[PDB]
């Protein structure tokens, strides 16, 4: 497999960031790819046996490093707003063009001119309608995660303390609350559908969980409101008979 | 060196045939290899299929693509798409006479919509569990032909249609959500900018 | 200089039989002048020639997509590079310069031809002498040409007409020179 | 019927590498490590095919890293020198006032390091000569070719220095 870290990161313009990657395929060649805000995939570096072989006119800002064949790291000293992208790490058997590339999960980097525009999501759960219950014998709960920036979120439903996947639909992309501004906060929805009898049980508990990836305990915070750090914001609801 | 493929998103009903166009303009490629990469929802990039010889064709997961050096194309085909095929498909190009360096197309998003055998379209109003003065509007149980139009007002928020599967009952449904802080906002006119079935149920709250 | 030397050699051999009909591929690694690990397309996996290559064979054969890559080398590597240079390597045809002169024994200089397949034959008056076919052997000039001296040990008597015949794949008919 | 070999080597501690393609004994091309350029044996070859020399430099980079591992494996056992077998010859019948070229062919030797010069009347002649790279062999020794165009009172020697030779080997060719 190809493991890379971190999964998410948000930082201010001019800071330093370090990405790390490792592959366990015994491969000789590893890569770094950038996916800009237009989903266009473009190669950045390529290393073969701890040595750089391909540099696609990457700014001197970027500094890849590898002291082992299976490792490849990337350091961006003094990031710019243009560095906000998704960075994919890959590996190939060797530098031959006829070899498959095996990609990691990616690193989603968000570079901001002003960290004051980072906000965690506010989560709310909306109980099913009496009309839907009596019309379809089914019950749907809608979850709204609103007012968060950037869009580094992972939503999940929890029923009676266990994470569920069946009957869940989450929007694949968030929508912008004020789409005019390019720094606008985001909103995201999700809907869990169960049978009417399961919802009408008071002993059943439903919780919408939103994992947010924000600042770390390391970065300083001048503002009066709470430092928008990585956290979990949830909204819950219990079943009701009538 | 550039790769052009089908732009944007393609919505297809299940069991229908699919063609994803891809052409490459090798202008200085001494030994081009053709690749199709796929990214299923929630996962990372992975190889779908690849062809290394100029005349042959590659196949995987029911998909099929023929390296055609004459029309410098590499179109992807499938006779019957499944709901599990919904993903983003990337057409790639490399030069085997050099270091491996993948040039990617813009990517094509595929959405396979299932057939709803017993539609029952309705718009319900759901109230929040904490506060009761907040609510959303839920348009659910409509056929796959219905297209939910996104809002043209910055203060009204409409999500795209979603497909959830209750696997215990073996039931599938479509759903879109709409909410707003405007005073004159109501679930009766929330989806007025979309063409919904005439028999859509609007219960009186 | 007194300090010792250490040599590492890698050779990727493509063996062709009847064009690209039957192709065999070899990925050979050498220490000084001793092979220690080798991939053979007939075997299908890496094998240790000596004890020195045992770790590489074990480690390489376990790498992801390695066996699938080397087993396809006869197509992506050998048969590909065969067609890239086929116009100026397999089909290279340079016609020979034949010169006859003695210095008695006659010498048939055959210079600047390619490829190495060639036949030289002496003729006393149309009989093709066999006794005295002293040949210096085929030698390679290193510049994509060959030459070979073909001496004949006979006493040229009066108006005897000796013929040096040359047969080469570049020509359609044999080439003859007289003295 | 035909054999195509991609030959590579690296030598320590001299830190010199080489990369070439052999077709039935003749070099298709080599890669000059100094200029990072592909050098075809015949100038016409470069107009019919192409090869990115970058991949050759990467292979040599791997061969250098592999050599230390192999040397460390063998408890630093060196290579035993093998004396070469020179053979001078001309490629055309010799004729006065008609140009020709000598060929000093070094054969069967290792390691691939030689000091080869052209001696005319006891004095070295460095004008107008040409050299080829080390060529591989089936027994994994090496070959080499040197050329000297000239016009046939003058004696010509080919001085060859190799570590496997106790004294510099001289091979004479006069008319």
């Amino acid at each position: 497999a190809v493991f890379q870290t971190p999964n998410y990161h948000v930082t201010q313009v001019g800071n330093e960031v370090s990405f790390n990657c490792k592959q366990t395929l015994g491969h000789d060649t590893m890569y770094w790819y950038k996916q800009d805000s237009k989903k266009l995939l473009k190669i950045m570096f390529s290393y073969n046996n701890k040595q750089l072989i391909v540099n696609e006119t990457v700014p001197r800002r970027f500094s890849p490093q590898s002291s082992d064949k299976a490792h490849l790291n990337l350091r961006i000293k003094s990031v710019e707003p243009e560095d906000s992208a998704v960075y994919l790490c890959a590996s190939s058997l060797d530098w031959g063009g006829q070899n498959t590339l095996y990609f990691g999960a990616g690193t989603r980097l968000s570079v901001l001119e002003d960290l004051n525009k980072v906000f965690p999501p506010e989560v709310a759960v909306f109980e099913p309608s009496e009309a839907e219950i009596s019309h379809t014998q089914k019950a749907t709960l809608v979850c709204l995660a609103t007012g968060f920036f950037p869009d580094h979120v992972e939503l999940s439903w929890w029923v009676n303390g266990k994470e569920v996947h069946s009957g869940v639909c989450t929007d694949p992309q968030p929508l912008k609350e004020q789409p005019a501004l390019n720094d606008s906060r985001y909103a995201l929805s999700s809907r869990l559908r169960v049978s009417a009898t399961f919802w009408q049980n008071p002993r059943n508990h439903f919780r919408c969980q939103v994992q947010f990836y924000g600042l770390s305990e390391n970065d300083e915070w001048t503002q009066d409101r709470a430092k928008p750090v990585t956290q979990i914001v949830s909204a819950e609801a219990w079943g009701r008979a009538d | 060196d550039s790769v052009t493929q089908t732009e944007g998103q393609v919505t297809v009903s299940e069991s229908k045939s699919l063609i994803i166009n891809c052409t490459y303009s090798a202008t200085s490629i001494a030994y081009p290899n053709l690749f199709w990469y796929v990214r299923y929802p929630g996962e990372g990039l992975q190889l779908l299929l690849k062809v290394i010889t100029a005349g042959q064709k590659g196949s995987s997961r029911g998909f099929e693509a023929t390296y055609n050096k004459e029309t410098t194309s590499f179109h992807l085909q499938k006779a019957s798409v499944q709901e599990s095929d919904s993903a983003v498909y990337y057409c790639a190009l490399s030069d085997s006479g050099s270091f491996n360096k993948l040039t990617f197309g813009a990517g094509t998003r595929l959405a396979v919509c299932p057939y709803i055998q017993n539609p029952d379209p309705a718009v319900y109003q759901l109230r929040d569990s904490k506060s009761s003065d907040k609510s959303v509007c839920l348009f659910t149980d409509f056929d796959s032909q219905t297209n939910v139009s996104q809002s043209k007002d910055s203060d009204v928020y409409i999500t795209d249609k979603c497909v959830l599967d209750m696997r215990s009952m073996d039931f599938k449904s479509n759903s879109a959500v709409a909410w707003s802080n405007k005073s004159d906002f109501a679930c009766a006119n929330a989806f007025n900018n979309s063409i919904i079935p005439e028999d859509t149920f609007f219960p009186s709250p | 200089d007194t300090r010792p030397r250490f040599l590492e050699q890698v050779k990727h051999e493509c063996h062709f039989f009847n064009g690209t009909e039957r192709v065999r591929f070899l990925d050979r690694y050498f220490y000084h002048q001793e092979e220690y690990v080798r991939f053979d397309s007939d075997v299908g996996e890496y094998r240790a020639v000596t004890e020195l290559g045992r770790p590489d064979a074990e480690y390489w054969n376990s790498q992801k997509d390695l066996l699938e890559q080397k087993r396809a080398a006869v197509d992506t590597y050998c048969r590909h590079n065969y067609g890239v240079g086929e116009s100026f390597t397999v089909q290279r045809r340079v016609y020979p310069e034949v010169t006859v002169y003695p210095a008695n024994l006659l010498v048939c200089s055959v210079n600047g031809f390619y490829p190495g397949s060639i036949e030289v034959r002496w003729f006393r008056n149309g009989q093709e002498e066999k006794t005295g076919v002293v040949s210096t052997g085929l030698i390679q000039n290193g510049d994509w040409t060959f030459q070979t001296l073909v001496m004949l040990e006979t006493v040229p008597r009066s108006g005897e007409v000796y013929t040096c015949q040359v047969e080469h794949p570049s020509l359609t008919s044999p080439l003859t020179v007289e003295w | 019927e035909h054999v195509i070999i991609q030959a590579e080597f690296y030598l320590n501690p001299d830190q010199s590498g080489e990369f070439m393609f052999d077709f039935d004994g003749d070099e298709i091309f080599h890669v000059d490590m100094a200029k990072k350029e592909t050098v075809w044996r015949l100038e016409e070859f470069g107009r019919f095919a192409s090869f990115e020399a970058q991949g050759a430099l990467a292979n040599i980079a791997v061969d250098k890293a592999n050599l230390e591992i192999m040397t460390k494996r063998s408890n630093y056992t060196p290579i035993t020198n093998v004396p070469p077998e020179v053979t001078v010859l001309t490629n055309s019948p010799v004729e006065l006032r008609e140009p020709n070229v000598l060929i000093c062919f070094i054969d069967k030797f290792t390691p691939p390091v030689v000091n080869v010069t052209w001696l005319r009347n006891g004095k070295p002649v460095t004008t107008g000569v040409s050299e080829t790279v080390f060529l591989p062999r089936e027994d994994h020794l090496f070959r080499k070719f040197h050329y000297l165009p000239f016009l046939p009172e003058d004696v010509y020697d080919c001085r060859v220095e190799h570590w496997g030779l106790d004294e510099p080997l001289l091979k004479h060719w006069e008319f």
Binding site: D28, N48, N49, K69, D94, W95, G96 | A30, Y31, D95, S96, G97 | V10, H12, D27, P55, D56, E58, Y59, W60, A73, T76, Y77, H80, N81, G83, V84, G85 | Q6, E8, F21, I28, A49, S50, F51, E52, G55, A56, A58, N59, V62, D63, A65, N66, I69, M70
Partner: peptide, 13 residues
């Protein structure tokens, strides 16, 4: 066309 080089693999360490 273009010539393709078989890359050199890294030795076991």
């Amino acid at each position: 066309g273009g010539y393709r080089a078989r890359p050199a693999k890294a030795a076991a360490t």
